[PDB]
Design a protein around this ligand. Sequence first.
Ligand SMILES: [Zn+2]
Ligand SMILES: [Zn+2]
Length: 224
Amino acid sequence: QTPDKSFKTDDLIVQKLTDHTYQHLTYLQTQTFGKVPCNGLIVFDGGEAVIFDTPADDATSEKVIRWVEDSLKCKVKAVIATHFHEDCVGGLKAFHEHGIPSYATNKTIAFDKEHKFPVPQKGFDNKLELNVGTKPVVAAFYGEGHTRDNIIGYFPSEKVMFGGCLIKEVDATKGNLADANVDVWPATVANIRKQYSDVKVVIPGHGKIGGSELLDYTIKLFSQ
Ligand SMILES: [Zn+2]
Ligand SMILES: [Zn+2]
């Protein structure tokens, strides 16, 4: 077993999901969408942690980093931006001030430079393999959808998937399609469903965490 260091505040929620994974949840205030909750993932083992998506800004990012060090007794080994939008890179500056390396695909990094968003520092094409303690962490591209660059995260030792905004909560609407390739989105998530057939936890970019049924739902939503 592992301790439960979950907690809730007005600007930040951290919630245990499995023995070695935690959801982080922050909020992004827009004038065209309003206040939207945003999900990320923390996985850890052996004093090392990896985080998928920054919390929405530098202040909540700072709180998460300190909590990983103080409560989990882990060093944040890396942060991975799962696409170029601000609910993935908004807090990158705080990670960088802590000397925490940030990773994203080269496509994501080009997008962030073009949009003058904070830029992940280390690029890769299609797939990144990290270790947390002795545990594998995967981040990989399976096709376009919510954006042309979106990737997912997987922690196979506990079958936890961070789907990001490519994956919708059950009964969600299509959401923000401004950068989307909707015609291939079903095939992209079908590809993911085919390759992660025993996933136990699926975390959408926004909304309620569930199981593999979030893949089936997302495929339906964009297939009609
Ligand atoms: Zn997005
Ligand atoms: Zn999003």
